[PDB]
Design an enzyme around this catalytic site. Structure first.
Site, short mmCIF file in Angstrom:
data_model
loop_
_atom_site.label_atom_id
_atom_site.label_comp_id
_atom_site.label_asym_id
_atom_site.label_seq_id
_atom_site.Cartn_x
_atom_site.Cartn_y
_atom_site.Cartn_z
N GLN D 11 0.83 -1.21 0.00
CA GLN D 11 0.00 0.00 0.00
C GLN D 11 0.86 1.26 0.00
OE1 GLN D 11 -2.85 0.08 3.16
NE2 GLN D 11 -3.67 2.10 2.60
N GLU D 71 -4.40 -6.48 -1.07
CA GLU D 71 -5.80 -6.13 -0.88
C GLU D 71 -6.31 -5.31 -2.06
OE1 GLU D 71 -3.74 -3.51 2.28
OE2 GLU D 71 -3.08 -4.95 0.76
N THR D 145 2.32 -7.34 2.29
CA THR D 145 2.67 -7.33 0.87
C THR D 145 4.03 -6.69 0.64
OG1 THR D 145 0.30 -7.02 0.51
CG2 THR D 145 1.74 -6.91 -1.42
N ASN D 206 9.40 7.91 8.60
CA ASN D 206 8.20 8.74 8.67
C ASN D 206 8.34 9.86 9.68
OD1 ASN D 206 5.70 6.16 7.90
ND2 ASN D 206 6.95 7.49 6.60
N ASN D 228 4.91 11.36 0.33
CA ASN D 228 5.07 10.70 -0.96
C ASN D 228 5.51 11.68 -2.04
OD1 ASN D 228 4.00 8.80 0.71
ND2 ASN D 228 2.39 8.13 -0.70
N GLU D 254 26.67 4.16 -12.89
CA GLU D 254 27.69 5.10 -12.42
C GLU D 254 27.41 5.56 -11.00
OE1 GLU D 254 28.35 8.24 -15.13
OE2 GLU D 254 29.31 9.58 -13.68
N1 LIG Z 1 5.46 7.57 3.59
C1 LIG Z 1 4.41 6.76 3.50
N2 LIG Z 1 4.36 5.60 4.25
C2 LIG Z 1 3.28 4.78 4.15
C3 LIG Z 1 2.24 5.09 3.30
N3 LIG Z 1 1.31 4.11 3.40
C4 LIG Z 1 1.75 3.19 4.29
N4 LIG Z 1 2.96 3.59 4.77
C5 LIG Z 1 3.80 2.87 5.74
O1 LIG Z 1 3.54 1.48 5.65
C6 LIG Z 1 3.63 0.89 6.93
C7 LIG Z 1 2.69 -0.31 7.04
O2 LIG Z 1 2.78 -1.13 5.90
P1 LIG Z 1 1.66 -1.05 4.75
O3 LIG Z 1 2.20 -0.38 3.51
O4 LIG Z 1 0.46 -0.31 5.28
O5 LIG Z 1 1.26 -2.57 4.45
P2 LIG Z 1 1.65 -3.25 3.04
O6 LIG Z 1 3.11 -3.05 2.74
O7 LIG Z 1 0.78 -2.69 1.95
O8 LIG Z 1 1.33 -4.81 3.24
P3 LIG Z 1 -0.09 -5.27 3.85
O9 LIG Z 1 -0.06 -5.15 5.35
O10 LIG Z 1 -0.36 -6.71 3.48
O11 LIG Z 1 -1.16 -4.38 3.28
C8 LIG Z 1 3.27 1.98 7.91
O12 LIG Z 1 4.10 1.92 9.04
C9 LIG Z 1 3.50 3.28 7.17
O13 LIG Z 1 4.60 3.96 7.72
C10 LIG Z 1 2.29 6.25 2.54
O14 LIG Z 1 1.36 6.54 1.79
N5 LIG Z 1 3.38 7.09 2.65
MG LIG Z 2 -2.09 -2.46 3.12
#
Ligand SMILES: Nc1nc2c(ncn2[C@@H]2O[C@H](COP(=O)(O)OP(=O)(O)OP(=O)(O)O)[C@@H](O)[C@H]2O)c(=O)[nH]1
Ligand SMILES: [Mg+2]
Ligand SMILES: Nc1nc2c(ncn2[C@@H]2O[C@H](COP(=O)(O)OP(=O)(O)O)[C@@H](O)[C@H]2O)c(=O)[nH]1
Ligand SMILES: Nc1nc2c(ncn2[C@@H]2O[C@H](COP(=O)(O)OP(=O)(O)O)[C@@H](O)[C@H]2O)c(=O)[nH]1
Lengths: 54, 51, 50, 437, 50, 104, 39, 431, 431
Positions: D11, D71, D145, D206, D228, D254
């Site tokens: 995500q 998802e 994921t 973050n 982002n 490089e």
């Molecule tokens: N900078 C930034 N971090 C994000 C963003 N969305 C999620 N995260 C980070 O992702 C972490 C959690 O992992 P997710 O990306 O939500 O989960 P996933 O990698 O999609 O895998 P799943 O749990 O199966 O959905 C959190 O601690 C957030 O810091 C985003 O839009 N920007």
């Molecule tokens: Mg997710």
């Protein structure tokens, strides 16, 4: 041989460049460089105006 | 930009066939002949629609 | 440790001031100028950790 | 012919990719419909979009990206959003059942059924490609994921493609801010594919981006879109040499060659300096010296680790805009003579600088000020090990009385994985200490 | 623990030893110089004898 | 045909980048300086390793042995260092020098 | 006057003071009756 | 009709060569199309030295542009005086170099060298006298160092009787700009000293210092650097293209300047170089040109002439002038600063005079110096090399592209004993 | 073809030298843009003494401009006759030592001194039969005293035989402008004694009261003081710059003035001098000029010559004027004030009659006295120095800078030695 060997021949010659738009100086005279910012102040004014308006 | 105003005196600038910005890379000269799309080389005329 | 920039170190405090340079103009020489400061800095660092 | 394939998994990876492709389309003039209203190019004289987009016969420019998530939510949001006509329908691959914040579920049960489809799509994209620089893998270490499926995909890509650059952009957990519970377990498990399969892994944190947006951009209440967009600005500054004319052009090979000293050390901090807000840009000079010093200031870093407690192995500065090599060298000399920045003893050099002409573009309704000068520092240093020390401290105190291990064992993985990964991260920390000393 | 004047103290240590070295070099130089003038006067006398 | 293997000391940010003493490089009196090094026998005349400060450290390797570089002490003691005379610039540290007492 | 922590002085000189410091640092001194009336 | 084949490798070498052909096309009055638009026949007699006849009155340069990055090829094709070159001698690869000497030498850089040597062979047996080969590149990148040294070795293996002069931009440590430039320089100095018999090392820090003191130059960038380098490129071969009172070509300079075969790294310079504010305060006289040649800050190789002894000095003058004035000045410098000159060579100066000045100036001058102060940049490169070779840093790239550490040890040993040879010939008694 | 290189150091030095170059320019016909617009042919004949010829009709001066702060540099450049100077001859540091001999000599200036010696060696090389060097240093300050004497020492090593004259703007005991000017004066005239061929020491308060009493004029500021000093500096070399009836250059002046190597401290004097009210009521004659020369109130130093014996006296006359009056006036002076002349030196006055008078006037005279009453200036300076040094006041600014008290004590000791030698030759008898 007198044409350059004249004692007062140093009073008859332009230095090398005279002005900033002299036609004889070019890429081989190695005196008309592109590095002098002749329009540098105008460029700086334009950048300041752009930054202020933005 | 310094490079934008002293463009056409800058060492690395390739084939400005673009008017909004000049630093978009035109790689039409390199173009090995397997994917070449007959782009105008930097010293020849354009095609019908000249653009 | 000195200041946080070498530009504002001042000519009476750099280790190669002209006095030191006219000394190094002859062979041998080699003032013990920096080893003492290194040892003192290490001792002060150990004091800070303790 | 130079091209890159952008694989956004998780995500976080998908949302970062949405911001990145918004910035890319705005930079290359492509409207969100997918068609380019060129309107100023003389003939087909524009080749700047080749590295990211593929122009087809319908006038559309499909991106060289693969969006995968287990998802259906965020991917279906992309399909129902504005970029529906811009993205290919089969590039935005999605699953049905989520990975449940579980590395085992993302790597052994649910990640094993769509890995073939994403590998097929990557194969089609690379066969369409012909001068591929590498793969930009955007994901999160938070778990699911972005941990397990990303680890499996990186392993498969390293097996088949082999000698190809794999630049990783990984969301890293904060020292004390966190949104999950088992993400220490997920991070410890995914250290390996970012250690033995990656080629250059940029961690982002973050808390650090939050502090940047709170202090420099004056955003008291920021969302993930600003984070982002900052990551998009960094990756655009990285890739600008492949698509814009410049004085010194730094490609990916490089960049890696001039950055990483050893194959194990490939985790550099990333810093972007234009950072000032719009109203506060009226009062600052934002010159070359200022933007170079802002990178080495230990408050604009995007990992919560203090680089003064470390040694800079190398730095790759990518200057962008009206930046001249004389000011670059003056800033380099001032940084080298500065006491605070301490370089490692086996590197009297350490500044790979690349100047690019095309200044950065500002998003409409952005937060970053529209400037003329930019620097993007990518610095390999020994100070990133503090984050791993905090991480495996958290992992050790979780794994003491075997918390949450039953989920991972039920989804298939063994208990020895935790011990092996803990020992590998301890070896990595000792390796960074040995390199720094 | 080291004093908080180590850098200045070491710098003036170096200044003092350079000063001693250059006074002794001045003594050696004036000895060599008056030997040189004696040699020059003797050379002039020998030229006149020739 | 012999091994060089240079050795450097700890980093210190007072060392001014690269510095070469000018006795190795004086081309007005080199025929006297080099033969002075030969007659001394402890100072190497070698062409490399001229920079005794290379990056921010000192060269512990063959630019004079530790003997005769560690022996230039002008009889300094902490007993007389803790009480600086009033007319010099070191007396402004007296606000911190009296905090140290005196044993050795 | 008040010490002033200068170098050797009142005789011996730079070379003799350095040689004495070398002797002291490496071990025993050179000799007692060296440099009769500082020559 | 002696004539020189020009080769240019890497981005730096390509930009220097583009500026060089711009300068020597102005000197012959040639437009970027290729026609001769000059006024006098002196610019037309020896036009074959650098240009080859085409159909009509078109003059195609005898230059070979080589690079592994196509972006610089597009840039030098579409830049100023990019139309003068032939598209066939634009051989390139679409991979890159990565600032890797191993990648430029033992990998796909050696894929391109077949077509490269085919092009150079076509230009070489398109000749009738073939004075020699003149290469420009930089010892800081992959294609500049590795591929350039590969061409050097192959061309010397092909024609080991021709004057091979290469210029090469050596890396300065206070310019940096690359982290593996000591590796790239050490692995290439070995091939330079062993094969090339004339090398004019040029340094970017010296160029910047010249721009910032002798020319003010508020923003010089890479244009003025290549402009000064092109000035010294034309001033060393001016006597092949124009007649003069005392001619001297590349072979004569190599004979009179190189005492021993592995003693051939030079210190180029140029005069006059006058700032705009000091333009009107300066009168161009032969003693003034002689002083600006023999000024330390005017040097283009980052060495200090006072920090060493000259072995030989080539002085190439241009313009109408007096041979007596030239000879008395070049004798007076030897009589004045005789300490900065080896005493086992009487008359440490070769003197050449050409009576055709550049367009614009009435007089100009060119310095070439085989000084023993050239060892200090080699020592700086060697100390940076051992600094980043002590811990085996960045060697995994070179071992991946197929090198062992023994090649690095050979490079270090060769650079060390070459500097020691400089020191031994520098500290030599008269007899 | 004898050449003098001029040097100005410090604010006072730059101002005094600027006024000097103004009077030389409008005495030789040089306009502010540097072009000869004179009337007589006897103005461009001997102009290479002070002016290097450039292209066109340009005549740049042979001067070296030294400071560690750019404020006086910009003032001199912006003021009148500022465009005549070559921009290369504007060497200035950036920090600025400031009322500190240690900071002006041991550091700050001690790294700029390399570039200043480069410029001075440049001007000396651009000459034929160089007479020597004149300096307008300003004892009692910063850059003028310490760095000026450093320049004197370095150019004395470089050129040992050429004539060194300094103009020595020595401090005052009752003006009291600087609190450390006794330290600077005591520590710097020590360097002057062992290094200069001749010093024409000028104070400030004698300039003040000559302006107040002889000229009245109610507003001299610094401009008229610089005019008086500048007129004296033109008068001490008018015989070198112009043809005359009895020529005497700087070497002739030094030989006929100094009897001993450390007795080269002179009291200058210019003596056509009258107010606007008394201008037309004052006859201009040779006895009147000699009467105004041999006057205590007209001296450009604080030393009253009545209590003190003259050693050697020089009179440089300018104008069409009679040798019989000149010789009879010097004989009349020697016969009248015979008690102020040493018995062991008969006929101790020197004549130097030139032909061209200064602009505006018709006759003029320059007085150069070598009286033994000049010791009281050093006596007052040493009295202030030993008043300060007993309590070691203001000494940390030098000792922490890098000096030591032993140098101060030896400077005071050799000051006392010079004073004692002047007293010895004041009390010396004939037989
Ligand atoms: N900078 C930034 N971090 C994000 C963003 N969305 C999620 N995260 C980070 O992702 C972490 C959690 O992992 P997710 O990306 O939500 O989960 P996933 O990698 O999609 O895998 P799943 O749990 O199966 O959905 C959190 O601690 C957030 O810091 C985003 O839009 N920007
Ligand atoms: Mg997710
Ligand atoms: N003097 C000069 N140096 C240049 C120029 N272009 C690049 N360089 C230098 O060359 C070095 C990099 O070499 P590079 O061009 O990458 O070699 P390549 O990889 O073979 O193309 C940098 O350190 C630059 O300082 C130029 O136009 N002039
Ligand atoms: N006669 C004269 N004296 C001056 C002039 N300007 C300054 N002074 C004197 O010079 C002294 C200061 O010396 P200064 O020029 O500051 O030396 P610096 O610090 O090295 O520049 C003061 O006591 C002034 O009286 C001037 O134009 N004419």
């Amino acid at each position: 041989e007198w044409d350059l060997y004249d004692p007062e021949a140093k009073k008859k010659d332009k230095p090398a460049r005279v002005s900033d738009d002299d036609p004889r100086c070019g890429p081989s005279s190695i005196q008309k460089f592109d590095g002098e910012d002749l329009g540098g102040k105008e460029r700086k004014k334009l950048m300041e105006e752009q930054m202020r308006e933005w | 930009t310094f490079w934008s105003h002293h463009k056409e005196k800058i060492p690395g600038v390739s084939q400005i066939k673009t008017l909004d910005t000049p630093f978009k890379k035109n790689s039409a000269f390199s173009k090995p002949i397997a994917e070449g799309t007959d782009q105008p080389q930097p010293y020849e005329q354009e095609t019908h629609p000249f653009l | 440790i000195g200041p946080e920039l070498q530009s504002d170190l001042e000519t009476r405090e750099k280790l190669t001031r002209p006095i030191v340079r006219v000394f190094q103009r002859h062979p041998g020489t080699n003032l013990p100028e920096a080893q003492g400061i290194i040892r003192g800095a290490a001792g002060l660092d150990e004091s800070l950790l303790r | 012919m130079r091209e890159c394939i952008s694989i956004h998994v998780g995500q976080a990876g998908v949302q970062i990719g949405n911001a990145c492709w918004e910035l890319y389309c705005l930079e290359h003039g492509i409207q969100p419909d997918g068609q380019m209203p060129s309107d100023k190019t003389i003939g087909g004289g524009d080749d700047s979009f080749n590295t990211f987009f593929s122009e087809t016969g319908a006038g559309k420019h499909v991106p060289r990206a693969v969006f995968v998530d287990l998802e259906p939510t965020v991917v279906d949001e992309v399909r129902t959003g504005t970029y529906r006509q811009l993205f290919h329908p089969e590039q935005l691959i999605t699953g049905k059942e989520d990975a449940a914040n579980n590395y085992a579920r993302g790597h052994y049960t649910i990640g094993k059924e769509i890995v073939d489809l994403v590998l097929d799509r990557i194969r089609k994209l690379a066969d369409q490609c012909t001068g591929l620089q590498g793969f930009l893998i955007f994901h999160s270490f938070g778990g699911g994921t972005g941990s397990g499926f990303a680890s499996l995909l990186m392993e498969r890509l390293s097996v088949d493609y082999g000698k190809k650059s794999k630049l990783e952009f990984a969301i890293y957990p904060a020292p004390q801010i966190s949104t999950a519970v088992v993400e220490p377990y997920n991070t410890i498990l995914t250290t390996h594919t970012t250690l033995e399969h990656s080629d250059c892994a940029f961690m982002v944190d973050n808390e650090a981006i939050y502090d940047i947006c709170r202090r420099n951009l004056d955003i008291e209440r920021p969302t993930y879109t600003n984070l982002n967009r900052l990551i998009a600005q960094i990756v655009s500054s990285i890739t600008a040499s492949l698509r814009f004319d410049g004085a010194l052009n730094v490609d990916l090979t490089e960049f890696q060659t001039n950055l990483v000293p050893y194959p194990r050390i490939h985790f550099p901090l990333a810093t972007y300096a234009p950072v000032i807000s719009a109203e506060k840009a009226y009062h600052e000079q934002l010159s070359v010296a200022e933007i170079t010093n802002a990178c080495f200031e230990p408050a604009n870093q995007m990992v919560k680790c203090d680089p003064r407690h470390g040694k800079y192995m190398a730095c790759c500065m990518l200057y962008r805009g009206d930046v001249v090599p004389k000011d670059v060298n003056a800033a380099i000399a001032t940084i080298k003579t500065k006491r605070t920045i301490q370089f490692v003893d086996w590197c009297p050099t350490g500044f790979k600088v690349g100047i690019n002409y095309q200044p950065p573009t500002v998003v409409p309704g952005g937060d970053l000020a529209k400037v003329q000068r930019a620097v993007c520092m990518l610095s390999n240093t020994t100070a990133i090990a503090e984050a791993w020390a905090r991480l495996d401290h958290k992992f050790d105190l979780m794994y003491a009385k075997r918390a949450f291990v039953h989920w991972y064992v039920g989804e298939g993985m063994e208990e020895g994985e935790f011990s092996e990964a803990r020992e590998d991260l301890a070896a990595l920390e000792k390796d960074y200490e040995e390199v720094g000393v | 623990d080291a004093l908080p004047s180590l850098r200045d103290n070491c710098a003036q240590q170096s200044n003092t030893v350079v000063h001693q070295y250059v006074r002794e070099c001045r003594i050696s130089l004036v000895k060599l110089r008056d030997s040189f003038l004696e040699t020059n006067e003797e050379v002039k006398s020998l030229i006149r004898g020739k | 045909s012999y091994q060089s293997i240079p050795r450097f000391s700890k980093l210190h940010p007072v060392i001014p980048r690269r510095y070469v003493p000018e006795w190795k490089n004086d081309m007005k009196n080199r025929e006297l300086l080099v033969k002075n090094c030969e007659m001394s026998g402890i100072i190497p005349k070698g062409p490399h390793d001229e920079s005794l400060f290379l990056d921010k450290r000192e060269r512990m390797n063959e630019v004079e042995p530790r003997v005769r570089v560690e022996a230039k002490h002008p009889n300094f003691e902490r007993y007389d260092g803790l009480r600086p005379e009033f007319h010099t610039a070191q007396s402004k540290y007296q606000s911190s020098l009296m905090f140290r007492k005196d044993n050795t | 006057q008040d010490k002033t922590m200068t170098f050797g002085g009142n005789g011996m000189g730079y070379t003799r003071q350095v040689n004495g410091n070398v002797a002291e640092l490496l071990g025993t001194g050179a000799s007692p009756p060296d440099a009769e009336n500082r020559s | 009709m002696r004539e020189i084949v020009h080769m240019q490798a890497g981005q730096c070498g390509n930009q220097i060569g583009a500026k060089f052909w711009e300068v020597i096309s102005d000197e012959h009055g040639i437009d970027p199309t290729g026609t001769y638009h000059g006024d006098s026949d002196l610019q037309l007699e020896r036009i074959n030295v650098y240009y080859n006849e085409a159909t009509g009155g078109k003059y195609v340069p005898r230059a070979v542009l080589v690079d592994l990055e196509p972006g610089t090829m597009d840039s030098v094709r579409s830049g100023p005086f990019g139309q003068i070159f032939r598209p066939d001698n634009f051989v390139f690869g679409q991979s890159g170099a990565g600032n890797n000497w191993a990648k430029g030498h033992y990998t796909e850089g050696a894929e391109l060298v077949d077509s490269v040597l085919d092009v150079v062979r076509k230009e070489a047996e398109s000749c009738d006298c073939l004075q020699g080969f003149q290469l420009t590149h930089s010892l800081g990148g992959g294609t500049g160092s590795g591929m350039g040294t590969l061409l050097i070795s192959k061309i010397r293996e092909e024609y080991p009787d021709r004057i091979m002069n290469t210029f090469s931009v050596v890396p300065s440590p206070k310019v940096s700009d690359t982290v593996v430039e000591p590796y790239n320089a050490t692995l290439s100095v070995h091939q330079l000293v062993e094969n090339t018999d004339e090398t004019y090392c040029i340094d970017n820090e010296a160029l910047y210092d010249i721009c910032f003191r002798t020319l003010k130059l508020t923003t010089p960038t890479y244009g003025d650097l290549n402009h000064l380098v092109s000035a010294t490129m034309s001033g060393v071969t001016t006597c092949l293209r124009f007649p003069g009172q005392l001619n001297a070509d590349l072979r004569k300079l190599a004979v009179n300047m190189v005492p021993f075969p592995r003693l051939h790294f030079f210190m180029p310079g140029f005069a006059p170089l006058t700032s705009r504010g000091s333009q009107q305060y300066r009168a161009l006289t032969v003693p003034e040109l002689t002083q600006q040649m023999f000024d330390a800050k005017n040097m283009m190789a980052a060495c200090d002439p006072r920090h060493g002894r000259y072995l030989t000095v080539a002085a190439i003058f241009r313009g109408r002038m007096s041979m007596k004035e030239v000879d008395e000045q070049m004798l007076n410098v030897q009589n004045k600063n005789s300490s900065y000159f080896v005493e086992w060579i009487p008359n440490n100066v070769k003197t050449a005079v050409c009576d055709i000045p550049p367009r614009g100036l009435k007089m100009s001058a060119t310095f070439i110096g085989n000084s023993t102060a050239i060892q200090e940049l080699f020592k700086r490169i060697s100390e940076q090399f051992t600094a980043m070779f002590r811990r085996k840093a960045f060697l995994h790239w070179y071992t991946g592209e197929g090198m062992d550490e023994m090649e690095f040890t050979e490079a270090e040993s060769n650079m060390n004993d070459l500097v020691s040879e400089y020191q031994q010939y520098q500290d030599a008694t008269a007899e």
